[PDB]
Amino acid sequence: AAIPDEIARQIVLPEGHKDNVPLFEAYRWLRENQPLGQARVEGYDPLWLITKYADLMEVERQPQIFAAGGGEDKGSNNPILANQAGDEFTRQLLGGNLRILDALPYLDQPEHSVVKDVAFDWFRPANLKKWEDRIRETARASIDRLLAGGPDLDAVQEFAVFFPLRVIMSLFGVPEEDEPRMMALTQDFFGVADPDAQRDDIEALSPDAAAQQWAATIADFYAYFDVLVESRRAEPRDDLATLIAVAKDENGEYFPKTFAYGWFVAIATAGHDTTASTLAGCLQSLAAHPEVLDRVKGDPDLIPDLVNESLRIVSPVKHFTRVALQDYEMRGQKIKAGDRLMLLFQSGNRDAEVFDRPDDFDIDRRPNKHIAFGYGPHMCIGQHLAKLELKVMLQELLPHLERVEVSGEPKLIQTNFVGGLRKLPVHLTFS
Ligand code: HEM
């Protein structure tokens, strides 16, 4: 049978994600009772909810069967779940398809492979070591401002958001004065279904509102990035904007400018927001588990373990969607050609078949098998940058902290997509 309606709504609807407790209880109910079922929520396409760690790997390692963008019918699948009204809006705007960005999530092989190779080497761990000292100087400046502002603050909007944004804008060559605009458009981009993040220029109550907001935000990013692409093509610099802007195909022709725009939208949004969420989530967990803060201050080599467990618990990127290009049997179910799948990374990260006491915050999982970056050819390109920035910031910050207390109500972004904390009121005790 279909998944029961309120479990299905809890996971599919953005409102279902407002509060982590009921959301994670819905993922757990599925993993234990209906690990591979079809959600049939009014206003959405039917979705196979991929809740199990092994099933996430099985789907993601088979891109010839489970496409992101629809295969040769490019743009026939939206890799980021919109409602039906929203996909209809986008098909009206684009003329029959859903490929609203030329960013990696929308691409299938071999196009995905050619485009990804423009930046694959830049993002490898050995090629990121050259940025470690700049990252550390940015962390130290951020910590100097935290110490100067006193013990009481929102650890998200008054601390965690700024460091990853500065790091990524510095690695582009985007001037510091443009950070507020990039932050505002990122809130519009990941807030399409959040009641406190609605743009003024869209009909907020329309059935397609989130899709209108997505499109409006992309158009603003395009206007900003068209100037940066033209600037770096005319005057190349030693920065990531130039690598993207001047990229040429195998025939010596620039990739179309929208491909550079796609890289820029992804790096200007996911490039900072996910790291901010994970840092804020880590601080929240150190407040719940003060013994972990004591241990990591005692042994700074535990910092990468703390990062890995923060990534598993926070898992801020909640899903991408796939479409079956042929019928496929998995876990005793018959997925049909054309059926859509929702990859629930947060649920894979609580799978008791893989993680002992999966809801516990345990930095001593070695190895820490989390799937917070996904899997397969679409696996997060930024993962090594995120792990470096989180390591560097914790190495600099934790010596300055004796204790984190949460002093007010945490708030999450209401999204089924790229979520995590927007507010974490704290009282810090400095060492
Ligand atoms: C804590 C930090 C982050 C987490 C948890 C995260 C998570 C993810 C996840 C789950 C995916 C989808 C993988 C899949 O489809 O199997 C993804 C894709 C992606 N992420 Fe990350 N991300 C983070 C940081 C970053 C950073 C720092 C950047 C860039 C500077 C970045 C850029 C991307 C891009 C471009 C994609 C699309 C890859 C593709 O479709 O091939 N991410 N990320």
Ligand SMILES: Cc1ccc(Br)cc1
């Ligand atoms: C996680 C993520 C990557 C690329 C885009 Br575009 C949006 C979100």
